[PDB]
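Hey all, quick one. A colleague (J.T.) asked me to put the magnesium ion job into the tracker so the inputs and the structure tokens live in one place instead of scattered across chat threads. No bug as far as I know, just bookkeeping. Sequence used:
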Amino acid sequence: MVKIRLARFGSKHNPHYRIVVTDARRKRDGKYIEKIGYYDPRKTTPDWLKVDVERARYWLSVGAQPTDTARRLLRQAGVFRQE
Amino acid sequence: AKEKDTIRTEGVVTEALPNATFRVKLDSGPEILAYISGKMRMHYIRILPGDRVVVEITPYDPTRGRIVYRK
Amino acid sequence: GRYIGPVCRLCRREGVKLYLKGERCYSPKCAMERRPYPPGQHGQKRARRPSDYAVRLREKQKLRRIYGISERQFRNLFEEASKKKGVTGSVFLGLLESRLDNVVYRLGFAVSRRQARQLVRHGHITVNGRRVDLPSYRVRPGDEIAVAEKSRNLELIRQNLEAMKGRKVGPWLSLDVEGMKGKFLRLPDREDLALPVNEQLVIEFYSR
Amino acid sequence: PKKVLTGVVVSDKMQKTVTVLVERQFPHPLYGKVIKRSKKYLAHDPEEKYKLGDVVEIIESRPISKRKRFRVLRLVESGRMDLVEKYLIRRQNYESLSK
Amino acid sequence: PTINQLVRKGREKVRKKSKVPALKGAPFRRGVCTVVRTVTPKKPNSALRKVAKVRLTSGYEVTAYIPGEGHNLQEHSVVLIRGGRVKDLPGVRYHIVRGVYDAAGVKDRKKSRSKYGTKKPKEA
Amino acid sequence: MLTDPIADMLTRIRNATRVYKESTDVPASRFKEEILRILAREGFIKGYERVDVDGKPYLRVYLKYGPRRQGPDPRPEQVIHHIRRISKPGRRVYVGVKEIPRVRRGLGIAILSTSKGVLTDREARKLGVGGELICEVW
RNA sequence: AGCUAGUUGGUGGGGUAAUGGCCCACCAAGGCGACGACGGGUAGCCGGUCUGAGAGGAUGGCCGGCCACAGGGGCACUGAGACACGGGCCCCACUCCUACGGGAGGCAGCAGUUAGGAAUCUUCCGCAAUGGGCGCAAGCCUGACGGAGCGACGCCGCUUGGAGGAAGAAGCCCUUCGGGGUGUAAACUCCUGAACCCGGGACGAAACCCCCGACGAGGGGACUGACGGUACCGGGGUAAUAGCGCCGGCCAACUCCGUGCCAGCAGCCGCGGUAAUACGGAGGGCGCGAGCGUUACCCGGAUUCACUGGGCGUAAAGGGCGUGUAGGCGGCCUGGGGCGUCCCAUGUGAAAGACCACGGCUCAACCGUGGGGGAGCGUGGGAUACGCUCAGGCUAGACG
Ligand SMILES: [Mg+2]
Ligand SMILES: [Mg+2]
Ligand SMILES: [Mg+2]
Ligand SMILES: [Mg+2]
Ligand SMILES: [Mg+2]
Ligand SMILES: [Mg+2]
Ligand SMILES: [Mg+2]
Ligand SMILES: [Mg+2]
Ligand SMILES: [Mg+2]
Ligand SMILES: [Mg+2]
Ligand SMILES: [Mg+2]
Ligand SMILES: [Mg+2]
Ligand SMILES: [Mg+2]
Ligand SMILES: [Mg+2]
Ligand SMILES: [Mg+2]
Ligand SMILES: [Mg+2]
Ligand SMILES: [Mg+2]
Ligand SMILES: [Mg+2]
Ligand SMILES: [Mg+2]
Ligand SMILES: [Mg+2]
Ligand SMILES: [Mg+2]
Ligand SMILES: [Mg+2]
Ligand SMILES: [Mg+2]
Ligand SMILES: [Mg+2]
Ligand SMILES: [Mg+2]
Ligand SMILES: [Mg+2]
Ligand SMILES: [Mg+2]
Ligand SMILES: [Mg+2]
Ligand SMILES: [Mg+2]
Ligand SMILES: [Mg+2]
Ligand SMILES: [Mg+2]
Ligand SMILES: [Mg+2]
Ligand SMILES: [Mg+2]
Ligand SMILES: [Mg+2]
Ligand SMILES: [Mg+2]
Ligand SMILES: [Mg+2]
Ligand SMILES: [Mg+2]
Ligand SMILES: [Mg+2]
Ligand SMILES: [Mg+2]
Ligand SMILES: [Mg+2]
């Protein structure tokens, strides 16, 4: 299965996440397919979370299955919204 | 520390050996390999086999000595 | 840590006065004003031909000591300067100056550089809004330095302010002398500063 | 873009197999002096339509034999034994300089 | 020479032999002595330098230079070697590192301590 | 056999400059002529023409020199100090448009043969081309 | 220095998801090779890492990708996928039980034991985050992971105070006996206030879940912390660890006593055999600073394997010459091909790093974000001066 999932990248107590497109069976930090989003849970950043929407949509269309956190993030950045 | 546990014992020079090293027959037992002291070298005081010389011997290895005394 | 020990000894070594205590290192007392010779036994001994390396080394020591920094840190700063585009020397000097403790000193917030550093450490100094207690800090220009509010009470600070109340600051800095504030505007130049440094020599020393 | 090469027939001793020497010219990684490297490829031709002395186009194909992975696309130019002769001479020399 | 020649052969990369077969490039190697004696240097120098034939955990028996002011080492004693050519002596490319195992520190040493394995003396 | 022509020509020129011979000879080719033209344009030579000595096409190469500076070694000032044929045979050096050398950081030239004819480094830069670095000149 | 007999090819078959000498039967007698085969050693490979002006050279730890292996060997099976790390079968090596017939094992998973060894961690907590598997889901598991512990092992940050304070206390050391040094260093005055105590105390965690809405979007609500009562803020609050190397030249720093080619130092030259700036100690200095030195190993400096960039009459170095194969190189003109060569476009060159910009942790390390570059390689177009190649011709080379 291909998932849009999150990848930790930062440091001890200072995490950062890459909302990413990739096969299930990889290292949670491994060679993914495409970087499409970045998010910080610590929200420190004025521009913290940002995703690239069109790419995400495309991925969804092919049938990339997002995990829960990732899904939430997508929703927040309005990938799942429809108008 | 500068250690003077050194033995200052007499020995009649037995063997003419190379490099101003001379096996000298001690009266502290056998003939050890005893070499010339630098002073002797400086003063050009010649040792031939048969000289009753004082030979400086450290306990660590008595194998080697030193011709301290000018014959 | 720092140097931390006998200071005007460094002054003595250098051959030139280095204002490292401020006052006294202003009066007839830096031991340089009187006693103008290297420390140790052979102070008045025949003054000999310094090696090409040696002069450079001395220069480096002068400069490094002036700001009072660990060698490692200095080296790092130099490296950074080299990396960054521009005249590696002048730029290096500017970077050195841009240091928090030095900035504090140049404002007349403390008469001495070590003293300034101490002040900075102790949560007496606040840049823009936060206290900063780490004297190596890069004051990036367009920045305001202030005395902390819960410590702007201190007698020493007041005295220091008075000592600069009137007398003119450098053209790259500024200050509010009343509300205990300060401005950093221009990242200073080689020609903005009057240190007995000859930074070329320092650079040469570093090269190998 | 099925990798294609201009090479020269050097042998037809095997059924349907034409041996082709590709002389590839590239510049040395360190020196840049332009070297001339020959590599043999055994090529598939169901006709034996090709002979020694012929220069041919060679296509990177699907295999037919362990170490025969090229079909002969097309004939370029016949009547240049020159290049083959040299190779043969070299081969002969190879046996000589041993013992 | 000329580029074609170079291409044919290349440059024979200067493959470097090490000055120490303590093996594994091991910064230190431990061993036990077979003998412990003193050795005359050569023709530039005349002194008596203390040295020990030491068998190794790799098997290579090395005479090894004891430094300091005078050792306490006997025979069946564990010693640790740092290498590093001694100029005067033959067969000896090795310093014993005093301050570990049986080679106890240089007593009375008061200046350059670390090299010798001397604990800090207590001031006033 | 004259294994390089261009290099030989260059060498001859150098020799002439050394000995203060005002004009040298050298067999005629198109490439050579082009090179000479470039040199002339630059100002490395007074002039050149194409004679027929014996019956064989040849080039009059009118050499250039600097004013006779007096004193110790009065010998005329050198215009071409050094000229090295870079892309020798059996070592053909092709530089890209990124790689075209800053020869004496400006003061002199590299004669580059390009797809767009024989020329100098500045010219190459102007057109935006790389090619073969026949020779270095200063 | 020759290697090869399933070995190189063919025909037919089998086997495979699929090509194939993968295997087999039959036929052919080839195939590779000095442009370095086979043989031996060595060694996971790389993105990179370090050095380096660069070209390069070494290195391939962590982090990422690929491979290969799970005591050694051999084999399949099941399955989408293994020849299957904590699945199976077999022989052997080894440990364990045994009622001697036989069984059970495999930490190169985390942690730990043991050995080896210079040397390398806690038989830690947690499912909170993120990811994995299962599942409608709740949830279940998860030594992936997230953290803490131990080690100056590395990098980076901070403290060991600061301000005054003698024409110069003592202590110690040197002296030409006046003096100088230590050194504003101390003491002493003043201030600050790591430690340290108490008060509060997180961001990381809003989802999945429930309901309105059709189980869609959207909207409201709830639970949810190993770190850790930590980070951090507020008050209080004490002047509160300095070390290590060197000190002849290189190389930055000099004197005295002790020693006398002895004891000793040494990275090299070398120093020491009685006035040692080289040894031991003291003061003084100088380097660095919670480190600093030694050793190992790599590069550099070594333009000392040299492409950038070395040479060869005498220094190491021209072979004894000749002919000649491969190979390398090659006059002048004209024209074509366009392989080299160049160029443009474009595809690639994953992320991480390195480089620039900005941002975040009080700075910085560290991280985040954005950008740029990038040798090489593929694909389409272009250019023909140069090399290649094809054709024609020339006479300077060469031959007659
Ligand atoms: Mg989850
Ligand atoms: Mg003795
Ligand atoms: Mg078939
Ligand atoms: Mg086979
Ligand atoms: Mg092998
Ligand atoms: Mg191996
Ligand atoms: Mg390499
Ligand atoms: Mg196995
Ligand atoms: Mg199956
Ligand atoms: Mg298995
Ligand atoms: Mg398994
Ligand atoms: Mg496997
Ligand atoms: Mg383990
Ligand atoms: Mg043990
Ligand atoms: Mg052990
Ligand atoms: Mg660990
Ligand atoms: Mg638990
Ligand atoms: Mg249940
Ligand atoms: Mg369990
Ligand atoms: Mg971890
Ligand atoms: Mg003080
Ligand atoms: Mg107080
Ligand atoms: Mg508390
Ligand atoms: Mg000196
Ligand atoms: Mg020493
Ligand atoms: Mg000499
Ligand atoms: Mg020394
Ligand atoms: Mg000394
Ligand atoms: Mg530090
Ligand atoms: Mg160190
Ligand atoms: Mg000779
Ligand atoms: Mg010939
Ligand atoms: Mg030929
Ligand atoms: Mg050719
Ligand atoms: Mg030609
Ligand atoms: Mg990248
Ligand atoms: Mg990036
Ligand atoms: Mg910042
Ligand atoms: Mg022709
Ligand atoms: Mg003739």
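Adding what we noticed when we looked at it: Chains C and D do not touch (no CB pair under 8 Å). Residues 7-96+194-207 of chain C form a domain with the Ribosomal Protein S4 Delta 41; Chain A, domain 1 fold (CATH 1.10.1050.10).
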